[PDB]
Design a protein around this ligand. Structure first.
Ligand SMILES: NS(=O)(=O)c1c(F)c(F)c(S(=O)(=O)CCO)c(N[C@H](c2ccccc2)[C@@H](O)c2ccccc2)c1F
Ligand SMILES: [Zn+2]
Length: 257
């Protein structure tokens, strides 16, 4: 099946998912100098106060924390969005070393990791149906640089030893995703896709300008996860990022400057 290695990695995905070479694929390089400031864009509304995390799982591609999205509890609205998007999960992409790991890049700069908070448009009723629509999903992307620790990430890092291999999961309640956000909500936005198969072109990307800093010890815990199930050969889960794809006929908009 698909993955991130030489024989089944991003350059191979188009064979099973031909949209991989489509007109609105993600991630992209964000050219800060040619993004267009749009003074008409609204501030992003991030209403995470009633978030209810439920579980964390290693799916053999990343790890993900899943939320109760059966009611409006943790939602994203405003910015470039029409209507209300419900948070369903977050996950990360990261590198084998600190100089790569992010999917979006900024002026060709790669971060050590990128956090994706995935939300679905409540007019579509569920994430599956939303994934089939051009305005189905909004993904809030946040870059991680290595430096000071992020205290609000610690609860995540400390449970990862319990989900080392593909298919392991644990209950994971009362995690506050507000503790992963940087101070600023300034952002770039463009229309794109999921960055993993099936690569649906259904995402409004909102990528925050300000990275969060995480420590070396925090990212080192990510890199101890395994892609494999227990009892297959050990392959560390690292470099689970798709590289920048061509922008094609898109303009990236900025909320600032
Ligand atoms: N970088 S990305 O944001 O594009 C991305 C990922 F990188 C990613 F790893 C996942 S994943 O679910 O953790 C394993 C690969 O599916 C998902 N999950 C998909 C998803 C979850 C919740 C809501 C919408 C989409 C995936 O599970 C999916 C794909 C297609 C249709 C429904 C669900 C994902 F969206
Ligand atoms: Zn992602």
């Amino acid at each position: 099946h698909w993955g991130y290695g030489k024989h089944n990695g991003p350059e191979h995905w188009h064979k099973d998912f031909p949209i991989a070479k489509g007109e609105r694929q993600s991630p992209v390089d964000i050219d800060t100098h040619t993004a267009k400031y749009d003074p008409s864009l609204k501030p992003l509304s991030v209403s995470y106060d009633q978030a209810t995390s439920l579980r964390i799982l290693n799916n053999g591609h990343s790890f993900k924390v899943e939320f109760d999205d059966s009611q409006d509890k943790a939602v994203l609205k405003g910015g470039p969005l029409d209507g209300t998007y419900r948070l369903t999960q977050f996950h990360f992409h990261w590198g084998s070393l600190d100089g790569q790991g992010s999917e979006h890049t900024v002026d060709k700069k790669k971060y050590a990791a990128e956090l994706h908070l995935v939300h679905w448009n409540t007019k579509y009723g569920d994430a599956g149906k939303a994934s089939q629509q051009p305005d189905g999903l909004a993904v809030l992307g946040i870059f991680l640089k290595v430096g000071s620790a992020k205290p609000g990430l610690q609860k995540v890092v400390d449970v990862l030893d319990s989900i080392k291999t593909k298919g392991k999961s644990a209950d994971f309640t009362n995690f506050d995703p507000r503790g992963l956000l940087p101070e600023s909500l300034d952002y770039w936005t463009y229309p794109g896709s999921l960055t993993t198969p099936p690569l649906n072109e259904c995402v409004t990307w909102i990528v925050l300008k300000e990275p969060i800093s995480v420590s070396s010890e925090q990212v080192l815990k990510f890199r101890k996860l395994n892609f494999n199930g227990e009892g297959e050969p050990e392959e560390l889960m690292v470099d689970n990022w798709r590289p920048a794809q061509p922008l094609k006929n898109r303009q990236i908009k900025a909320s600032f400057k």
